[PDB]
């Protein structure tokens, strides 16, 4: 058996949407012990859906300017973040991760169509891989905002967003930003 | 707004530490600071008192993150 | 209500800057009514969308 | 069951027989209508049935089979079924200015251009689609797209060269 | 002030005997307002009736005109 | 029940009543439509692949020139009819066959060839009544060159219509010059003499093979009028246009630009975003400056005789 | 109040769609035509003379008279479609073609479409000069 962090298992983790199912990783043969793998996943197109989505949450968390190469900093932020999820919920935190991802990526987006100087967006459809890509970005960004200038830890404030999105609650940052992009799109239609 | 925490405990605040805190399921110096108006050093040390009392378990300890739990 | 889709063919790439992708769409209630759509982001053959309307007509502004 | 009928000329007969799958299929299927060509009156004639869904499934079918008679392309006529407001405005080429003789035939040369290049241009920039009969000019597009399709057409056939017309479209196409 | 169609009436047009159909429509007539007779105001109208609206086996590219 | 490529082109999924279904492996690999390969993916497990014998093939080709269809058939179209021959020699009585059947029995009429003989919406009632598009041992072939050779042997087959065949109404082309009938309706030049003296000939074939052919005795078709005119000098170059005499003289490669050659697929609802409600017209390329047009476009001006009264400002191609 | 007629039997009227270049008229009459039933002008709806000959002003006129037509029992119409004719243009505009499609869906049984435009055999002097006019 291959436990993430030696203590979290994968066979419990259950994907709801078939839309996201082939574009969200670890269930069975993607199961790896650490997020850090360092493989060429952006060598050509549609290879970054085969990398483990904990490593996806890693690589989008080193993202800011002062943190911009420090991956072992980040897989430590991840490791302490799952164990705060488990102590607040008791669920396998990978399931909480996936239930926070699915509820986060929007499903219709606006797009500017027309000549320059004319702003008339039309709603289009959101790709499944982009809905993965949009959600992780919206998840990581909410960890920065409520934890840039206060006592709370980013290994902690990540776990407060990644729980509040698996509720689909209004308290999460990645939910309000889905409730805007997909609110604006249905006024563009 | 300004946030003026306490540096040493009060009679009432040391009770909230002794009585309420060991039933949180997630105990952390940032959390204790957030709920009790206490600076990070004092709340970080008070959890080391509550390990010496044995009232509280220990999950993980790091440079920056130390995680505690209610008693079983 | 909320339906699903099947990418049957990727027909082209529309939009102002070459942004959206013009995609042949099968439904997943296995109805042979292929309502054909425009997505945002990368999409290859065999994907599956999630609509909030299937009432998008071939109409020009 | 109510019906429409619509005639044909003799040079437009052979386009129907070349296009009697392609005019045929979308009227009968997408609207649930019945279609005939009365050769004893030589008219195209459609009627409703019980499978006719929309109340105006007939009205926008008549304009589709009108625009094909008026010389428009089959595919470019199909959008009268689909789009809510496409129209057509027809002309007499002498309704703007009394040309005759070869001065009439030089209005056609200006409004067509060498190789159709002037006709191909005004369709692109005014979001329309036009067809030149001899004395007749037929345009097809939206109303404001029509209203600035006539003026590029009118101003070719009262003297101005195409370049003054090409310039003066785009100053109005900015709005 | 006055709703005029309460002051109207309704007559029937009936074709002469060369045709199959006779009753072929209606025609509005204001009633006798004391002075002017309602039959007087009807007495000269023309009807642009087609052919197949009168005789059923017939092709209606033709018309007829008919005086009340 | 021999299956053909036209049965899958019209998608006649009728593997339910006829159950002796044999077919050729080549005539399913030559199909370039993807919905036929979609048909090949699931259903054809009930049929069987089979080839005919070279003894059987040559005897098919003997009365094929005697029914005048051997150049009109394709090469793969030959083997499918020979594939029916082993099935008929296997299952059915050979004693009820014939070959070298019958003469022409010209039924000369005063009907013009281009008259709408049984075109559906055309009427001289006959409506469409929107159910009838689908109402417009053996075989299932929609090619008349295939269907002609079958019924002259006296071989009743069926179609996507589940009933058997009794009536075969189609059109062939007889050379008015060398008296040579081909079943092809696409070509406009002859196959034996190579002229444009092919004329439209309507046929009517029964199940027994009663060939009776309406040769249109009408001098509007039998006409020498618009047939003599002087031709320009033979021109050689990249952009020369010689006036299309033979079926194969080497024209220079003149092609439309692919941004002009394509029309609108306005049916498709992936349609809203971007450009004008019509196709953009090609005003930029040198396909447009050389006035290259479609070969199908302008065909009515080909039918006009050369020595006529053209208007004084026209110039065609 | 009106035609006490059985329901399978229509009560026809005559609708006059007069096109111009400044507005369009919709004008529902008797089969004789001497009485009209309601005349809703196309420049009664829109309060912008710029938009007085709109297809949109044509829809708003024809919906407000098929309301009045259905109010008074007229279930069917024969349409005398009309340009301005005479010296000026002969073919009725799209603002006439709009209102036709407008009261087609509004529940009126549309029978014969008639082209009553005033056409001269041979007319007087065109209003434009020898030089031409914008049209
Ligand atoms: Zn020949």
Q: How many Å lie between the alpha carbon of A46 and the closest alpha carbon of chain C?
A: 8
User: Does the distance separating the beta carbons of B59 and A83 come in below 8 Å?
Assistant: yes
Domain range list for chain A: 1-189
Domain range list for chain D: 1-82, 83-175
E5 touches chain G (CB under 8 A): yes
- Distance (Å, rounded) from C-alpha D150 to C-alpha D156? 10
- Distance (Å, rounded) from C-alpha F224 to C-alpha F71? 29
Name residues with Cβ closer than 5 Å to ligand 1, which is an ion: F 175, 177-178, 180, 190, 192-193
Q: Parallel, antiparallel, or unpaired: how do β-strands F2-3 and F139-140 relate?
A: parallel
Provide the token pair at F250.
Answer: 């080497």
Place of tokens 């040493």: B8
- 3-class secondary-structure state, position A4: strand
Provide the token pair at D10.
Answer: 């003799």
* Best residue of G10, G110, G135 to probe chain D, by most D CBs closer than 10 Å: G135
**Resolution in A, one decimal?**
3.1
Sign of CA dihedral F255, F258, F259, F264: positive
DSSP B17: I
Q: How far is the CA of F180 from the centre of ligand 1 (A)?
A: 6
Sign of CA dihedral F81, F86, F89, F91: negative
- Distance (Å, rounded) from C-alpha G126 to C-alpha G132? 10
Q: Which of F187, F248, F197, F249 is nearest to F227 (CA)?
A: F197
How would you list the strands of the sheet with D128-132, edge to edge?
D87-92, D136-141, D128-132
Assigned architecture for domain B3-72: Orthogonal Bundle (1.10)
**Size of chain G, expressed as the number of residues it contains:** 135
Q: What is the CA radius of gyration of chain A?
A: 17
The H or E element that residue G112 is part of is strand G109-115
Are F102 and F211 in contact, with CB atoms under 8 Å apart? yes
Q: How far is CA F247 from the centre of its chain?
A: 17
DSSP C15: S
Q: Burial of F179 by CB count in 10 Å (0-12 exposed, 13-18 middle, 19+ buried)?
A: exposed
User: Does the distance separating the beta carbons of E28 and G37 come in below 8 Å?
Assistant: yes
Residues 6+ apart with CB under 8 A from A11: A27, A28
How far the first Cα of chain E sits from its last, in Å, is 32
Domain residues for the domain of C61 are 1-61
**Residue numbering of the annotated binding site of F for Zn(2+):** 175, 178, 190, 193
Q: How many Å lie between the alpha carbon of D161 and the closest alpha carbon of chain F?
A: 18
* Best residue of E15, E48, E64, E65 to probe chain G, by most G CBs closer than 10 Å: E48
Residues 6+ apart with CB under 8 A from E31: E7, E8, E9, E38
Helix axes D59-67, G94-105, angle to 10 degrees: 150
The H or E element that residue G102 is part of is helix G94-105
Tabulate helix, strand, coil % of chain E (nearest 5).
15, 30, 60
Residues 6+ apart with CB under 8 A from F184: F72, F145, F173, F191
User: Does the distance separating the beta carbons of B60 and A88 come in below 8 Å?
Assistant: no
Q: How far is CA B8 from the centre of its chain?
A: 13
Q: Which of G15, G13, G23 is nearest to G48 (CA)?
A: G23
Q: F19: how many CB neighbours lie within 10 A of its CB?
A: 10
- Count Cα atoms within 13 angstroms, Cβ side, for A5: 17
- Distance (Å, rounded) from C-alpha G20 to C-alpha A103? 58
User: Does the distance separating the beta carbons of C38 and F268 come in below 8 Å?
Assistant: no
**Residue numbering of the annotated binding site of F:** 175, 178, 190, 193
Measured CA to CA in angstroms, residue F61 lies from F34, F57, F148 at distances of: 32, 7, 13
The phi, psi pair for E53, rounded to 5°, reads -85, 5
Residues 6+ apart with CB under 8 A from A40: A47
Q: What are all long-range contacts of E33-39, with beta carbons under 8 Å and residues at least 24 apart? A: E33/E7, E38/E9
Q: Which of C1, C2, C3, C11 is nearest to C37 (CA)?
A: C11
Measured CA to CA in angstroms, residue F303 lies from D36, D134, F115, F293 at distances of: 27, 20, 17, 17
Q: Parallel, antiparallel, or unpaired: how do β-strands G76-82 and G109-115 relate?
A: parallel
The three-point CA angle F96-F100-F103 to 5° equals 115
- Distance (Å, rounded) from C-alpha A82 to C-alpha F250? 75
- Distance (Å, rounded) from C-alpha A55 to C-alpha G116? 77
Q: How many Å lie between the alpha carbon of F29 and the closest alpha carbon of chain C?
A: 22
Are F68 and F135 in contact, with CB atoms under 8 Å apart? no
- Distance (Å, rounded) from C-alpha F147 to C-alpha F141? 7
- Distance (Å, rounded) from C-alpha E13 to C-alpha G30? 11
Q: How far is CA B18 from the centre of its chain?
A: 9
Residues of C in contact with F268 (CB under 8 A): 11, 36, 58
- Distance (Å, rounded) from C-alpha A126 to C-alpha A107? 5
User: Does the distance separating the beta carbons of B26 and A84 come in below 8 Å?
Assistant: yes
Provide the token pair at F37.
Answer: 């390969």
Q: How far is the CA of E22 from the centre of ligand 1 (A)?
A: 63
- 3-class secondary-structure state, position E50: strand
Q: Where are the beta strands (DSSP E) in A6-120?
A: 108-112
Are D103 and D93 in contact, with CB atoms under 8 Å apart? no
Are A13 and A92 in contact, with CB atoms under 8 Å apart? yes
- Distance (Å, rounded) from C-alpha D146 to C-alpha C22? 29
Number of domains in chain C: 1
Provide the token pair at E11.
Answer: 């007559």
φ/ψ region of D131 (left if φ > 0, alpha if ψ in -120 to 50, else beta) reads beta
- Distance (Å, rounded) from C-alpha F127 to C-alpha A163? 66
Q: Which of D16, D81, D4, D14 is nearest to D45 (CA)?
A: D4
How far the first Cα of chain D sits from its last, in Å, is 45
Sign of CA dihedral D92, D94, D100, D106: negative
Domain residues for the domain of G4 are 1-135
Helix axes A71-89, A154-164, angle to 10 degrees: 50
C9 touches chain F (CB under 8 A): no
Number of domains in chain G: 1
- Distance (Å, rounded) from C-alpha C20 to C-alpha A112? 10
φ/ψ region of D117 (left if φ > 0, alpha if ψ in -120 to 50, else beta) reads alpha
The dihedral over CA atoms of F7, F11, F12, F14, expressed in degrees to the nearest 10, equals 120
Provide the token pair at F297.
Answer: 């476009």
Q: How far is the CA of F199 from the centre of ligand 1 (A)?
A: 9
DSSP per-residue codes, chain F: -EE-HHHHHTT---TTT----EE-SHHHHS---HHHHHHHHHGGGGSEE----HHHHHHHHHHHHHTT-TTTS-HHHHHHHHHHHHHHHHHS-GGG---S--------BS--TTS-TT-TTEE-----GGGGGGG---EE---HHHHHHHHHHT---B-SSSSBP--EEEEEEEETTT--EES-SS--S-SSS-SS-EEEEEEEE-SS-----B-B--TTTS--GGG----PPP--SSS------SSS---------HHHH----TT-S---SSS-SSPPP--SSHHHHTT---SSTTHHHHHS-SSS---TT----
Residues 6+ apart with CB under 8 A from F56: F82, F85, F86, F89
Are A80 and A87 in contact, with CB atoms under 8 Å apart? no
DSSP per-residue codes, A60-93: TTS-SSTTTT-HHHHHHHHHHHHHHHHHHH-S-H
């Amino acid at each position: 058996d291959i436990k993430l962090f030696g203590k979290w298992s994968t066979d419990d983790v259950q994907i709801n949407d078939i839309s996201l199912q082939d574009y969200i990783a670890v269930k069975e043969k993607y199961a790896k012990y650490l997020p850090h793998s360092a493989g060429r996943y952006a060598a050509k197109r549609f290879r970054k859906a085969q990398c483990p989505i904990v490593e996806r949450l890693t690589n989008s968390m080193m993202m800011h300017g002062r943190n911009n190469g420090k991956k072992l900093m980040t897989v430590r932020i991840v490791k302490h973040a799952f164990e705060i999820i488990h102590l607040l919920t008791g669920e396998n935190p990978l399931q909480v991760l996936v239930n926070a991802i699915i509820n986060s990526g929007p499903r219709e987006d606006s797009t500017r169509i027309g000549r320059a100087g004319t702003v008339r967006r039309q709603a289009v459809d959101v790709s499944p891989l982009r809905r993965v890509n949009q959600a992780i970005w919206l998840l990581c960004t909410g960890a920065r905002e409520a934890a840039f200038r206060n006592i709370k830890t980013i290994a902690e404030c990540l776990a407060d967003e990644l729980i509040n999105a698996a509720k689909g609650s209004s308290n999460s940052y990645a939910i309000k930003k889905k409730d805007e992009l997909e609110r604006v799109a249905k006024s563009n239609r | 707004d300004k946030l003026n925490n306490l540096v040493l405990f009060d009679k009432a605040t040391y009770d909230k530490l002794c009585k309420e805190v060991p039933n949180y399921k997630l105990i952390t110096p940032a959390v204790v600071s957030e709920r009790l108006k206490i600076r990070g050093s004092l709340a970080r040390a008070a959890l080391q008192e509550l390990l010496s009392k044995g009232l509280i378990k220990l999950v993980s300890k790091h440079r920056a993150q130390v995680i505690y739990t209610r008693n079983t | 209500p909320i339906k699903l889709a099947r990418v049957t063919k990727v027909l082209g790439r529309t939009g102002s800057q070459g942004q959206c992708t013009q995609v042949r769409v099968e439904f997943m209630d296995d109805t042979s009514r292929s309502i054909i759509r425009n997505v945002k982001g990368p999409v290859r053959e065999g994907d599956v969308l999630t609509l909030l309307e299937s009432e998008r007509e071939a109409r020009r502004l | 069951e109510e019906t429409r009928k619509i005639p044909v000329p003799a040079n437009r007969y052979t386009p129907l027989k070349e296009n009697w799958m392609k005019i045929f299929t979308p009227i009968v299927e997408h609207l649930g209508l019945q279609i005939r060509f009365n050769l004893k009156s030589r008219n195209v004639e459609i009627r409703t049935c019980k499978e006719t869904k929309d109340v105006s499934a007939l009205t926008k079918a008549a304009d589709f089979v009108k625009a094909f008679i008026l010389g428009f392309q089959v595919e470019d006529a199909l959008a009268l079924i689909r789009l809510d407001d496409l129209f057509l405005e027809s002309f007499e080429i002498t309704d703007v200015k009394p040309l005759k003789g070869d001065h009439l035939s030089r209005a056609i040369g200006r409004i067509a251009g060498k190789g159709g290049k002037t006709k191909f241009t005004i369709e692109n920039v005014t979001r329309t689609r036009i067809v030149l009969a001899d004395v007749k000019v037929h345009i097809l597009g939206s109303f404001q797209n029509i209203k600035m399709a006539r003026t590029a057409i009118c101003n070719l056939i009262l003297g101005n060269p195409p370049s003054k017309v090409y310039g003066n479209i785009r100053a109005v196409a900015s709005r | 002030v006055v709703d005029p169609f309460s002051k109207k009436d309704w007559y029937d047009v009936k074709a002469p005997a060369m045709f199959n159909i006779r009753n072929i429509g209606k025609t509005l007539v204001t009633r006798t307002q004391g002075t002017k007779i309602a039959s007087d105001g009807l007495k000269g109208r023309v009807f642009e009736v087609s052919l197949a609206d009168l005789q059923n086996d017939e092709v209606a590219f033709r018309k007829f005109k008919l005086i009340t | 029940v021999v299956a053909d490529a036209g049965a899958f082109l019209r998608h006649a999924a009728l593997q339910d009543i006829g159950k002796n279904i044999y077919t050729i492996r080549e005539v399913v690999t030559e199909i370039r439509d993807k919905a036929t390969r979609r048909r090949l993916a699931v259903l054809p497990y009930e049929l069987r692949f089979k080839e005919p014998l070279p003894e059987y093939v040559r005897l098919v080709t003997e009365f094929s020139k005697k029914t005048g269809d051997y150049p009109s058939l394709s090469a793969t179209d030959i083997q499918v009819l020979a594939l029916t021959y082993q099935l008929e020699a296997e299952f059915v009585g050979v004693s009820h066959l014939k070959q070298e059947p019958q003469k022409v029995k010209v039924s000369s009429s005063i009907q013009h060839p281009e008259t709408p003989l049984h075109i559906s919406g055309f009427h001289l009632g006959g409506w469409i009544t929107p159910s009838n598009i689908k109402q417009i041992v053996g075989c299932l072939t929609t090619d008349f060159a295939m269907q002609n050779v079958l019924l002259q042997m006296g071989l009743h087959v069926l179609a996507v219509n589940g009933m058997l065949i009794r009536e075969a109404r189609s059109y062939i082309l007889r050379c008015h010059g060398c008296f040579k009938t081909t079943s092809d309706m696409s070509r406009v030049f002859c196959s034996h003499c190579g002229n444009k003296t092919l004329k439209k000939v309507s046929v009517t074939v029964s199940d027994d093979g009663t060939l009776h052919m309406h040769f249109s005795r009408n001098p509007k078709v039998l006409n020498p009028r618009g047939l003599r005119y002087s031709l320009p000098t033979p021109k050689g170059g990249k952009y020369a246009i010689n006036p299309h005499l033979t079926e194969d003289q080497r024209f220079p490669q003149l092609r439309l630009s692919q941004k002009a050659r394509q029309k609108t697929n306005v049916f498709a609802p992936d349609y809203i975003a971007g450009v004008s409600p019509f196709v953009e017209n090609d005003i930029s390329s040198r396909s447009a400056t050389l006035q290259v047009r479609d070969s199908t476009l302008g065909a009515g001006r080909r039918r006009l005789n050369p020595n006529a009264s053209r208007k004084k400002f026209v110039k065609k191609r | 109040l009106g035609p006490q007629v059985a329901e399978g039997e229509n009560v026809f009227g005559v609708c006059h769609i007069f096109a111009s270049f400044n507005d369009t008229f919709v004008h529902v009459t008797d089969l004789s035509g001497k009485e009209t039933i309601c005349r809703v002008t196309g420049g009664m709806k829109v309060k912008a003379d710029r938009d007085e000959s709109s297809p949109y002003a044509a829809m708003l006129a024809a919906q407000d008279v098929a309301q009045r037509c259905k109010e008074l029992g007229i279930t069917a119409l024969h349409i005398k479609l009309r340009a301005t004719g005479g010296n000026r243009t002969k073919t009725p505009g799209p603002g006439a073609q709009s209102a036709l499609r407008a009261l087609a869906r509004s529940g009126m049984k549309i029978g014969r479409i008639e082209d009553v435009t005033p056409i001269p055999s041979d007319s007087t002097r065109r209003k434009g000069g020898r030089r031409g006019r914008r049209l």
